[PDB]
């Protein structure tokens, strides 16, 4: 089937965040716990262990499906992710399952057409929503919101819109709000009653 | 191929600045090239910039002086700009528009390539593993360059960045671990440069004998600006071909990209677009993306490209759009420090603020030597602390100083005197740089070298 | 000797602490506030242009 | 309670009409039915964002920080629906809620909101970092209608004077704390100790408060007098002699 990317798949109902989200990392699990269907942000400066968090979420996590998305990482780092992450593996009742039959990828270098970088975020959210409607707990990680932001600024500066403070467009706040709210726990539509959730982990590179 | 005769127009709607408006044009193409015949017979060329209806627009490289309304004529090749390419262009110097400035003839076309090119397949990308010797102690030791790492060299006006570039051209090569240097070439492209410091490039490259493995491009500051726009893409196309169609590693260097930014602003002004931040065009970011990231390693091949542009700082504005964007698209950076240039140190390269992203994998046991990472970390810490100790002695006074701090001061001063200084005509293999670094490290006892594991000290410090 | 050294040292160290507090809690915030204001004004002017 | 809702997923341009509708409903109930209606708005800043977007789409004259030049007039139009009317016993009160982008106050939204409205209640993150359930920085929180609702007949004659005195004392407390930050503890004087004591006890008692308590006005006045009693009689320069001769002890 075909679904427009800028629209939202209707839902039966939205529910409070109830069941917790856990990870193998002790600190994040006990001191600053996350919840299923929640929203989280992590810095993305060079040298920090963002790779640790990404890999731990990919491997140890309650989520049935996982979607990693890109928005431009200067190319070589994109090769690094594309190389390392298909190789990973986990114990599934004693099996290796190194194929990563629970992940999907979206990859954009620093020279793909501007709208591809701009709209990869909405593509990822749409895929996540589609898997959410299957009554599953899905988790999503964005490599950098800052890249999506500068892509938005780029298309605005193309359109010669009236520049706001720091040269960024007026869309910014509303777009980010709409993006982040899209997540949350949801009772799905369908006679075979069911419930799934969707959680987001963005990154920020000041 | 074009099996049809070319067209010849006589209609000239008007003239406006560096543009020319024509009418009654049949199926004009967007980026096709044209030639112009003048009343006195002088020949010229231009590119089609804007097309609408039967009207067309043409910008003229050589400048619109003397063009009339009836006597001038136009010609349409019916094709976008294409360039020849071949291995034999090594040893040749061009002016950027394809015309050889050297006394030699026009190169033959082994093939024709589209100047714009097309992007890389992200799946086919490969993480760089090997590295490139640079012949500068600081660049090889403090930092490193993988076969595919893109690093800029920030500098300022009045600093000798051209000279660092020239030395890199003279000294570039792969480390002999014990399939030859024939698999290594360089494409040096200088943009918008003074007449002086340009013939200097020519003469310095010719004397040493570097012509065997260099393809050179010169664009003068007084040349047409569109040539400046074209030239770096031409050189990147040549490097692309030589590195992918033929199994060879290549190291492309670009000089004075700020002039390229200026020419980009020029063409933006020509097409009547509203400026964005600080007057620079809003689509500068996409353009700089297109120029970069044409390098790395790919599946099923062996060739590689490594990119080293040079940037000029507009009065140390680190938030200026040009250096900022280039930083956002490149891995790591190298600085040039003005205080060192005042101190008469021939390489003015600074140490503390620089950083290489891919150093951790550009070296290792499979590369030159196992020790190198530990040595670099230890000497980095030592240099930083020694600078801090110089700051201490600035106020406290030497009389309240310890022996360890005296050794740190010795390390600092000898480092400055010997290691960083290179000389315009001195060569150092990586092994010699490591050995000199160990000579510097030897001043401290084995225990003071906290950062290095005891093993390396046991083998090497004695 | 030790006694007189002690008392003079005490007074001097208190003087230096006064200077450090003076630069830390007063001068820096003023300058950075000024700087932010300049940035804002310049951005507004560029926008009007 | 009659509700109107608009999530951030709803269409952007809808927000310009969203509040006027609710205000019209409130006006109906206030004037054609003489009810006492209280009104609360969640985020005026979102409304401002919708308005800047609409104006920028049309390429209209910009003023401060990319706003429409005439945003003042529209904010006036929304805010001015208030106050009682001759002959009818209804009433309209507004407590809109707006969010500064950051701690800056000179941002045009809060500035013009200050221009229109007759005061404001400030909330400071500094108090929130110290875990005071009302994070109300009383200092920048000027309100303009303390004139006609305070004094004999309403609460007491001494209300305005104690509030003014508390303002002065809290301000001197802030200033002496600033002096402490630079000079050190041992350079202060007894007056400084008294002012610091007042600041500490004031933030401990007057402001700090329960989520579900319900303090009467007279209790608040008693608390204020307790705080005032810390200072000697002579330091109270904002109070007339006639009032302290009766209420100070």
Question: Can you describe this structure?
Answer:
In chain A, 34% of the residues lie in helices and 19% in strands. In chain A, helix 4 (114-132) crosses helix 5. In chain A, strands 1, 4, 5, 6, 7, 8 and 9 form a seven-stranded mixed β-sheet that branches. A two-stranded antiparallel sheet of chain A has the order 2-3. The termini of chain A are far apart. Chain A is built from six helices and nine strands; from the N terminus they run E-E-H-E-E-H-E-H-E-H-E-H-H-E-E. Chain A is α/β, with parallel strands linked by helices and 206 residues long. Chain B has 462 residues and is of the alpha/beta class. Chain B has one domain (1-462): Rossmann fold (3-Layer(aba) Sandwich). Chain B has helices at 137-141, 161-171, 199-208, 225-244, 257-270, 284-291, 321-329, 338-342, 359-362, 372-395, 403-420, 430-441, 454-460; strands at 7-9, 14-16, 19-22, 32-37, 43-52, 55-60, 73-80, 82-85, 93-94, 111-114, 125-126, 153-155, 184-193, 214-220, 249-255, 297-298, 304-312. In chain B, the strands form four sheets. A seven-stranded antiparallel β-sheet of chain B has the order 1-7-4-5-6-3-2, with no helix packed on it. A six-stranded parallel β-sheet of chain B has the order 9-14-13-15-17-12, with helices on both faces. The radius of gyration of chain B is 26 Å and the shape is elongated. In chain B, 35% of the residues are buried. Chain C has 49 residues and is an all-alpha fold. Helix content of chain C is 96%, strand content 0%. Chain C has one helix and no strands. Chain C has one helix at residues 2-48. The longest helix of chain C has 47 residues, at 2-48. Chain C is rod-shaped.
